[PDB]
Short mmCIF file of N, CA and C in Angstrom, two decimals:
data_model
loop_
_atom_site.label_atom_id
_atom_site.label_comp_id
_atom_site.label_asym_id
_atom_site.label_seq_id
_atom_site.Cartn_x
_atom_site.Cartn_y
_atom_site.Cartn_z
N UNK A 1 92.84 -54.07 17.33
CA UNK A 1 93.50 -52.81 16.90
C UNK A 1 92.51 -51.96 16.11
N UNK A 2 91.20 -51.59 16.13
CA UNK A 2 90.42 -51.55 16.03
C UNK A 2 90.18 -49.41 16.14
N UNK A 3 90.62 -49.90 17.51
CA UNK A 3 90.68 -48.60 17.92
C UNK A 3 91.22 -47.41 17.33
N UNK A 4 92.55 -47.96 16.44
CA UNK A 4 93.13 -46.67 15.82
C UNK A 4 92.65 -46.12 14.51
N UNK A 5 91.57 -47.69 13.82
CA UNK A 5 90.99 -48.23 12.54
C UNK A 5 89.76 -47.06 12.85
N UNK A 6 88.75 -47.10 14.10
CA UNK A 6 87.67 -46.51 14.17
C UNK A 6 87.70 -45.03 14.28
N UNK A 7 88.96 -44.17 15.04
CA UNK A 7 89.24 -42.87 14.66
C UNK A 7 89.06 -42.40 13.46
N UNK A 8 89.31 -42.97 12.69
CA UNK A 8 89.04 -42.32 11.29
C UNK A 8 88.35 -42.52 10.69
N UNK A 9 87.32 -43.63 10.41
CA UNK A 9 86.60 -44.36 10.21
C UNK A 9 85.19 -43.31 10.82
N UNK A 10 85.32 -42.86 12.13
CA UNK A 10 84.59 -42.60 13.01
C UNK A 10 84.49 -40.78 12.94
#
């Protein structure tokens, strides 16, 4: 679940 973690992150 990483993916929704790295949007913002990102």
């Amino acid at each position: 679940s990483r993916s929704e973690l790295i949007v913002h992150q990102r």
